[PDB]
Design a binder for this molecule. Structure first.
Ligand SMILES: O=c1ccn([C@@H]2O[C@H](COP(=O)(O)O)[C@@H](O)[C@H]2O)c(=O)[nH]1
Ligand SMILES: O=c1ccn([C@@H]2O[C@H](COP(=O)(O)O)[C@@H](O)[C@H]2O)c(=O)[nH]1
Lengths: 212, 212
């Protein structure tokens, strides 16, 4: 939410991850943590970050398993302190509903990943993305993830989910997406490498904020 | 955390509560919601506030029942979306442990209320407060609540819990506590009426922040 900028913290060691996150904390209040960091440092890193930085944590786990396993993944993730989890919609409605049920039980949120931002997304996901977004609307999903790299697709996604839904978007910077154009449709942009690989992460974050 | 100021939102109707909270949101990022609002508008108000204001919510439920009931209260409260819950320590260790167990299961936090801020606290709670704080330390509690109205007691509490524990303090303003003096010992101050009954809540919040 702060500055409509979410940091994707994909460094793989705790010391560097804490250093960069602390350096840019005055610019953000929401950090997306994924498997690169969690599989290297453990799930306890989520609660550590949440406490140390007083930020919201979105666990980007691209959840994509059967219902029963998705439920277990969501339970472990919320137990670890995550405020929200990103779930793929392409595995179908039952898999998404399993995640929504756990989020309801635990007072948390599910973000539905519709279309991905990388080139390969055009092979199979893009053709199913509008229907995946419609499925989300039908299931009551209120939070979505769409691609910064294809603003016309981000626009179509926004059209399907409505103005009240919350939409975040990765692919800004390194993948080629533009901050300002992405924010014409998304509520917040996700930025990873453009900030965490910069010589001065704080200056990189400040520059993105200045550009928007 | 923001400005070390936590709003105690004890208005009893949704419209006024949303109005004041929205007016002072630029000054805070943490709202304490208690029974005055929840029993008048329902537990759904917690998730509504959390979403609408993107703030952390501490449920001040002064939990004070037997272990089994405390567990149920904590589960319902975290399911409703609260980030933390305030629990009395005077009912004993088993009652506090029940709350800690649910918070661990759900990735949330427990704040232990040691000494209360009102005059009647001197009758029974004050004499047991140092031991209640020690009990908290022994149980692994990391978040505490102490009285703004008695800074020497707040100092003694801080001494027992250590500098690493997080301490919040009500009784600022209406009850007579001073913002600056309270912050010599507490990490954050809780302020209710001095802000929510003010003719201009934003100006009242701004003034408190200016004074510190
Ligand atoms: O469609 C998607 C879904 C997720 N991410 C994730 O969002 C972040 C974008 O990082 P970056 O390209 O700004 O470094 C990474 O964690 C990446 O895994 C994408 O980039 N695209
Ligand atoms: O020892 C305690 C425990 C809790 N509260 C609560 O903190 C808030 C303080 O509000 P106010 O006196 O600033 O209006 C209220 O919600 C009140 O119930 C106290 O004041 N003192």
């Amino acid at each position: 939410v702060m500055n409509r900028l979410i940091l994707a913290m994909d460094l793989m060691n705790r010391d560097d991850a804490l250093r960069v996150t602390g350096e840019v904390r005055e610019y953000i209040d929401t950090v997306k943590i994924g498997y690169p960091l969690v599989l290297s440092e453990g799930m306890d890193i989520i609660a550590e970050f949440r406490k140390r930085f007083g930020c919201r944590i979105i666990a980007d786990f691209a959840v994509a398993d059967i219902p029963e396993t998705n439920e277990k993944i969501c339970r472990a993730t919320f137990k670890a302190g995550a405020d929200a989890i990103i779930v793929h919609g392409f595995p179908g409605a039952d898999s998404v509903r399993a995640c929504l049920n756990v989020a309801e039980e635990m007072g948390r949120e599910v973000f539905l990943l519709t279309e991905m931002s990388h080139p390969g997304a055009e092979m199979f996901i893009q053709g199913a993305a509008d229907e995946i977004a419609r499925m989300g609307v039908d299931l009551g999903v209120k939070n979505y993830v769409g691609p910064s790299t294809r603003p016309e697709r981000l626009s179509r996604l926004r059209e399907i989910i409505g103005q009240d839904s919350f939409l975040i978007s990765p692919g800004v910077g390194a993948q080629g997406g533009d901050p300002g154009e992405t924010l014409r449709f998304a509520d917040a942009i996700i930025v990873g490498r453009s900030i965490y690989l910069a010589d001065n992460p704080a200056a990189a974050a400040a520059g993105i904020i200045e550009s928007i």
